[PDB]
Amino acid sequence: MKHTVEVMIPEAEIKARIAELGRQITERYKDSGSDMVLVGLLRGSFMFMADLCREVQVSHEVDFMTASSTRDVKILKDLDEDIRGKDVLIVEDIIDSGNTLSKVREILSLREPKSLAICTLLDKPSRREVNVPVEFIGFSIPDEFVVGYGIDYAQRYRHLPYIGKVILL
Amino acid sequence: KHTVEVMIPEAEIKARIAELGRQITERYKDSGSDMVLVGLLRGSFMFMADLCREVQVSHEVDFMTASTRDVKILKDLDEDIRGKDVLIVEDIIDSGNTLSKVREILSLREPKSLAICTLLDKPSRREVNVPVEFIGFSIPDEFVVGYGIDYAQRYRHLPYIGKVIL
């Protein structure tokens, strides 16, 4: 489609918000004692994870899964590391339907982590099909056509440092 | 038992990534073919996040996980590269063995062009002569951590390149 992109959430607002998520995450987990892992879902989370992990002042590992995108949720690439007895934070660019995150949290729950929580940059609560708890949220937004900061449209705009709105022409 | 000293501060990494991005932009802006940056996981996720934001050319971002042992594809690319400009994005080149074998694998797919960008290069450690088009820093053979690189799963999230003192 002919289209344009405008800035919706600038780089600077994203960075200020990530520094606040990082203080909240630091506060919840600093006294735990247990090992911690941040788990990104690829490809969407790679940019969010890079900025977020740099703001989390608790010693942790960074790991990644790839899950498939009414069809079953399948593991295309599992974690490299064990999570048994660890504090685990799942990191995603956006929760809309909640279908993937829901099925990913159930799989990881089977491994008996000490705790399991989700951090999303973007939340579209109006799109929710399955309830899943989300402890840390960057921005709540309407159901806008968003790109950037790991979110693609037609293999375009993953590398934008801001969240943009796509205008169909 | 060890400490971590700062070796390359966050501000020097950021200034160097901005220059790398200007150089990659100048190299590829006239191509008018699709472009993809391909990061090697896990160590390249942070360098890729910072570098792709300084590349002022429309591209896709993709990842691959590669392993006296064969180089094996533990996770292949999601996208086709045939006829595209491809930049491999890597945290560190030392021996050159993995990068050499990854470049030969992707070469079979007949990209329009193939190049490597590494943040760190240890030319004292080279065992195989792999061509590297873009390099952030040539460094001594220090025990490096941070900025995506681990010591036993620790320090990946550090925003600077540190070195481990035993």
Coordinates of C-alpha atoms in Angstrom, one line a residue:
Chain A
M1 CA 0.0 0.0 0.0
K2 CA 1.0 3.7 -0.6
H3 CA 1.5 5.1 2.9
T4 CA 3.4 7.5 5.2
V5 CA 4.9 7.3 8.8
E6 CA 4.5 10.0 11.4
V7 CA 6.2 10.1 14.9
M8 CA 3.7 9.0 17.7
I9 CA 6.2 8.3 20.5
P10 CA 9.6 10.0 20.1
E11 CA 12.9 8.5 20.9
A12 CA 13.3 10.8 23.9
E13 CA 9.9 9.8 25.5
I14 CA 10.7 6.1 24.9
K15 CA 14.1 6.5 26.7
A16 CA 12.5 8.4 29.7
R17 CA 9.9 5.7 30.0
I18 CA 12.4 2.8 29.8
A19 CA 14.5 4.5 32.6
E20 CA 11.3 4.5 34.9
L21 CA 10.5 0.8 33.9
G22 CA 14.2 0.0 34.8
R23 CA 13.9 1.6 38.3
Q24 CA 10.6 -0.3 39.0
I25 CA 12.1 -3.6 37.8
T26 CA 15.2 -2.9 39.9
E27 CA 13.1 -2.2 43.0
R28 CA 10.9 -5.4 42.7
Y29 CA 13.9 -7.8 42.2
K30 CA 17.0 -6.2 43.9
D31 CA 16.4 -8.1 47.3
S32 CA 15.5 -11.5 45.7
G33 CA 19.0 -13.0 46.0
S34 CA 18.2 -15.7 43.3
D35 CA 19.6 -15.6 39.7
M36 CA 17.5 -13.5 37.3
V37 CA 17.0 -13.8 33.5
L38 CA 15.4 -11.4 31.0
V39 CA 13.9 -13.4 28.1
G40 CA 13.0 -11.6 24.9
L41 CA 10.7 -12.9 22.2
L42 CA 12.4 -12.4 18.8
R43 CA 12.4 -10.6 16.5
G44 CA 10.1 -7.9 18.0
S45 CA 11.9 -7.5 21.4
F46 CA 15.6 -7.1 20.4
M47 CA 15.7 -3.2 20.5
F48 CA 13.4 -2.9 23.7
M49 CA 15.6 -5.6 25.4
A50 CA 18.9 -3.8 24.6
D51 CA 17.6 -0.5 26.1
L52 CA 15.7 -2.1 29.0
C53 CA 18.5 -4.5 30.3
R54 CA 20.9 -1.5 30.4
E55 CA 18.5 0.2 33.0
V56 CA 18.1 -2.9 35.2
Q57 CA 20.6 -2.5 38.1
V58 CA 20.3 -6.2 39.2
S59 CA 22.8 -8.8 38.0
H60 CA 21.0 -10.9 35.3
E61 CA 21.3 -13.0 32.2
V62 CA 19.7 -12.1 28.8
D63 CA 18.2 -14.9 26.6
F64 CA 15.8 -15.1 23.7
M65 CA 13.0 -17.4 22.4
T66 CA 11.3 -17.4 19.0
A67 CA 7.7 -18.6 19.1
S68 CA 5.5 -19.0 15.9
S69 CA 3.2 -16.1 14.9
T70 CA -6.2 -20.7 16.5
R71 CA -3.0 -22.5 15.3
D72 CA -0.7 -24.0 18.1
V73 CA 2.1 -21.8 19.6
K74 CA 5.4 -23.6 18.7
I75 CA 9.0 -23.0 19.9
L76 CA 11.1 -22.2 16.7
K77 CA 14.1 -21.5 19.1
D78 CA 14.1 -22.3 22.8
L79 CA 16.2 -20.6 25.5
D80 CA 19.9 -21.4 25.7
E81 CA 19.8 -21.4 29.6
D82 CA 17.9 -23.1 32.4
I83 CA 15.3 -21.0 34.4
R84 CA 14.6 -23.5 37.3
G85 CA 14.6 -21.5 40.6
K86 CA 15.3 -18.2 38.8
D87 CA 13.4 -14.9 38.6
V88 CA 12.3 -14.6 35.0
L89 CA 11.0 -11.5 33.2
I90 CA 9.6 -11.9 29.7
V91 CA 10.3 -8.8 27.5
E92 CA 8.0 -8.1 24.5
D93 CA 7.6 -5.0 22.2
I94 CA 3.7 -5.1 22.2
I95 CA 0.8 -7.2 23.8
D96 CA -2.4 -7.0 21.8
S97 CA -4.4 -10.3 21.5
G98 CA -2.3 -11.8 24.4
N99 CA -2.4 -15.3 22.6
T100 CA 1.4 -15.8 22.2
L101 CA 2.5 -14.3 25.6
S102 CA -0.2 -16.4 27.3
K103 CA 1.1 -19.7 25.7
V104 CA 4.8 -18.7 26.2
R105 CA 4.2 -18.0 29.9
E106 CA 2.5 -21.5 30.4
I107 CA 5.5 -23.2 28.7
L108 CA 8.1 -21.5 30.9
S109 CA 5.9 -22.0 34.0
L110 CA 6.5 -25.8 33.5
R111 CA 10.2 -25.2 34.3
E112 CA 9.5 -24.0 37.9
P113 CA 11.1 -20.6 37.8
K114 CA 11.1 -18.8 41.2
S115 CA 8.9 -16.0 39.6
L116 CA 7.6 -15.3 36.1
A117 CA 6.5 -11.7 35.0
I118 CA 6.0 -9.8 31.7
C119 CA 7.3 -6.4 30.6
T120 CA 5.9 -4.9 27.4
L121 CA 6.8 -1.5 25.8
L122 CA 3.3 -1.2 24.3
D123 CA -0.1 -2.4 25.5
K124 CA -3.3 -2.5 23.4
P125 CA -5.8 -3.5 26.1
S126 CA -8.7 -3.2 23.6
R127 CA -7.2 -6.1 21.5
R128 CA -7.1 -8.6 24.5
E129 CA -8.5 -12.1 23.5
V130 CA -6.9 -14.1 26.4
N131 CA -6.3 -12.7 29.9
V132 CA -2.6 -12.7 30.9
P133 CA -1.0 -10.7 33.8
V134 CA 1.5 -8.0 32.6
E135 CA 3.4 -6.5 35.6
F136 CA 5.3 -3.7 33.7
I137 CA 3.9 -1.6 30.7
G138 CA 5.6 1.3 28.9
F139 CA 2.6 2.9 27.2
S140 CA -1.1 2.0 26.8
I141 CA -2.4 2.9 23.4
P142 CA -5.5 2.6 21.3
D143 CA -5.5 0.1 18.4
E144 CA -3.3 2.4 16.2
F145 CA -1.3 1.1 13.2
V146 CA 2.2 1.3 14.9
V147 CA 5.8 0.6 13.6
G148 CA 9.3 1.1 14.9
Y149 CA 11.4 0.1 17.9
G150 CA 11.3 -3.6 16.7
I151 CA 7.8 -3.5 15.1
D152 CA 7.8 -4.1 11.4
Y153 CA 5.3 -3.4 8.6
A154 CA 6.1 -5.5 5.4
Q155 CA 9.8 -6.0 6.5
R156 CA 10.2 -2.2 7.0
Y157 CA 10.8 0.2 10.0
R158 CA 12.1 -2.3 12.6
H159 CA 15.2 0.0 12.9
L160 CA 13.2 3.3 13.6
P161 CA 14.3 4.7 17.0
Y162 CA 10.7 6.0 17.7
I163 CA 7.2 4.5 17.5
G164 CA 5.5 5.7 14.4
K165 CA 1.9 5.7 13.1
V166 CA 1.3 4.3 9.5
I167 CA -1.2 6.4 7.5
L168 CA -2.7 4.3 4.6
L169 CA -2.9 6.5 1.3
Chain B
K1 CA 37.0 -14.6 41.8
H2 CA 37.6 -11.4 39.7
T3 CA 36.7 -7.7 39.1
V4 CA 35.5 -5.8 36.0
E5 CA 37.3 -2.7 34.9
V6 CA 35.8 -0.2 32.3
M7 CA 37.9 -0.7 29.1
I8 CA 35.7 1.2 26.5
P9 CA 33.2 3.7 28.1
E10 CA 29.6 4.0 27.0
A11 CA 30.2 7.4 25.5
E12 CA 33.1 6.2 23.2
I13 CA 31.0 3.1 22.0
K14 CA 28.1 5.6 21.2
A15 CA 30.4 8.0 19.2
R16 CA 32.0 5.0 17.4
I17 CA 28.6 3.5 16.5
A18 CA 27.4 6.8 15.0
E19 CA 30.5 6.9 12.7
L20 CA 30.0 3.2 11.7
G21 CA 26.4 4.1 10.9
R22 CA 27.5 7.1 8.7
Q23 CA 30.0 4.8 6.9
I24 CA 27.4 2.0 6.3
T25 CA 24.9 4.6 5.1
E26 CA 27.4 6.1 2.6
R27 CA 28.3 2.6 1.3
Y28 CA 24.7 1.3 0.7
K29 CA 22.5 4.4 0.1
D30 CA 22.8 4.2 -3.8
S31 CA 22.1 0.4 -4.1
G32 CA 18.3 0.6 -4.4
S33 CA 18.2 -3.2 -3.6
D34 CA 16.6 -4.5 -0.3
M35 CA 19.1 -4.6 2.6
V36 CA 19.2 -6.8 5.7
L37 CA 21.4 -6.6 8.8
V38 CA 21.9 -10.1 10.2
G39 CA 23.0 -10.3 13.8
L40 CA 24.7 -13.4 15.2
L41 CA 23.0 -14.3 18.6
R42 CA 23.4 -14.0 21.4
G43 CA 26.3 -11.6 21.7
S44 CA 25.3 -9.2 18.9
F45 CA 21.7 -8.2 20.1
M46 CA 22.9 -4.9 21.8
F47 CA 25.3 -3.8 19.1
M48 CA 22.5 -4.5 16.5
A49 CA 19.9 -2.4 18.4
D50 CA 22.3 0.6 18.6
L51 CA 23.8 0.2 15.0
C52 CA 20.6 -0.4 13.1
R53 CA 19.3 3.0 14.6
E54 CA 22.3 4.8 13.0
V55 CA 21.9 3.2 9.5
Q56 CA 19.8 5.8 7.5
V57 CA 18.9 3.2 4.7
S58 CA 15.6 1.1 4.8
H59 CA 16.5 -2.4 5.9
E60 CA 15.2 -5.5 7.6
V61 CA 16.8 -6.9 10.8
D62 CA 17.2 -10.7 11.1
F63 CA 19.2 -12.9 13.4
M64 CA 21.0 -16.3 13.2
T65 CA 22.5 -18.5 15.9
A66 CA 25.6 -20.5 14.9
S67 CA 27.5 -22.9 17.2
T68 CA 37.7 -29.0 16.2
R69 CA 33.8 -28.7 15.6
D70 CA 31.6 -28.0 12.6
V71 CA 29.8 -24.6 12.4
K72 CA 26.0 -25.6 12.7
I73 CA 22.9 -23.4 12.2
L74 CA 21.0 -23.6 15.6
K75 CA 18.6 -21.0 14.3
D76 CA 18.5 -19.8 10.6
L77 CA 17.3 -16.5 9.3
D78 CA 13.5 -15.8 9.0
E79 CA 14.0 -13.8 5.7
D80 CA 15.3 -14.7 2.2
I81 CA 18.6 -12.9 1.3
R82 CA 18.9 -13.8 -2.5
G83 CA 19.5 -10.5 -4.4
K84 CA 19.7 -8.4 -1.2
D85 CA 22.6 -6.4 0.3
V86 CA 23.5 -8.3 3.5
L87 CA 25.5 -6.9 6.4
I88 CA 26.5 -9.5 9.1
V89 CA 26.6 -7.8 12.5
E90 CA 28.9 -9.3 15.1
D91 CA 30.1 -8.3 18.7
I92 CA 33.7 -9.6 18.3
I93 CA 36.1 -11.2 15.7
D94 CA 39.1 -13.1 17.2
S95 CA 40.1 -16.3 15.3
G96 CA 37.7 -15.5 12.4
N97 CA 36.6 -19.2 12.2
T98 CA 32.9 -18.8 13.0
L99 CA 32.4 -15.6 10.9
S100 CA 34.4 -17.2 8.0
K101 CA 32.0 -20.3 8.0
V102 CA 28.8 -18.2 8.5
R103 CA 29.8 -16.0 5.5
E104 CA 30.3 -19.1 3.3
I105 CA 26.9 -20.5 4.3
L106 CA 25.1 -17.2 3.5
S107 CA 27.2 -16.8 0.2
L108 CA 25.4 -20.0 -1.1
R109 CA 22.1 -18.0 -1.1
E110 CA 23.5 -15.5 -3.7
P111 CA 23.0 -12.2 -1.9
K112 CA 23.6 -9.2 -4.1
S113 CA 26.5 -8.3 -1.7
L114 CA 27.8 -9.7 1.6
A115 CA 29.9 -7.8 4.3
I116 CA 30.7 -7.9 8.0
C117 CA 30.5 -5.2 10.7
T118 CA 32.1 -6.1 14.0
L119 CA 32.2 -3.8 17.1
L120 CA 35.4 -5.4 18.4
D121 CA 38.4 -7.0 16.5
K122 CA 41.4 -8.8 18.2
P123 CA 43.8 -9.1 15.2
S124 CA 46.4 -10.8 17.5
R125 CA 43.9 -13.9 17.6
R126 CA 43.3 -14.3 13.8
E127 CA 43.8 -17.9 12.6
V128 CA 41.9 -17.5 9.2
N129 CA 41.9 -14.5 6.9
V130 CA 38.2 -13.4 6.7
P131 CA 37.5 -10.0 5.1
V132 CA 35.9 -7.5 7.6
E133 CA 34.6 -4.2 5.9
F134 CA 33.7 -2.3 9.1
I135 CA 35.3 -2.4 12.5
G136 CA 34.4 -0.3 15.7
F137 CA 37.7 -1.0 17.7
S138 CA 40.8 -3.1 17.2
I139 CA 41.7 -4.1 20.7
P140 CA 44.4 -6.2 22.5
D141 CA 43.6 -9.8 23.5
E142 CA 41.9 -8.7 26.8
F143 CA 39.2 -10.7 28.6
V144 CA 36.2 -8.6 27.4
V145 CA 32.7 -8.4 28.8
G146 CA 29.6 -6.2 28.5
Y147 CA 27.6 -4.8 25.6
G148 CA 26.2 -8.3 24.8
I149 CA 29.3 -10.3 25.8
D150 CA 29.1 -12.6 28.9
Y151 CA 31.5 -14.1 31.5
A152 CA 29.7 -17.3 32.6
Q153 CA 26.3 -15.8 31.7
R154 CA 27.1 -12.6 33.7
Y155 CA 27.6 -8.9 32.5
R156 CA 25.7 -9.0 29.1
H157 CA 23.6 -5.9 30.1
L158 CA 26.6 -3.7 31.0
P159 CA 26.4 -0.5 28.8
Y160 CA 30.3 -0.3 28.4
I161 CA 33.0 -2.9 27.4
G162 CA 34.7 -4.1 30.5
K163 CA 37.7 -6.4 31.0
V164 CA 37.8 -9.2 33.7
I165 CA 40.9 -9.2 36.0
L166 CA 41.5 -12.6 37.7

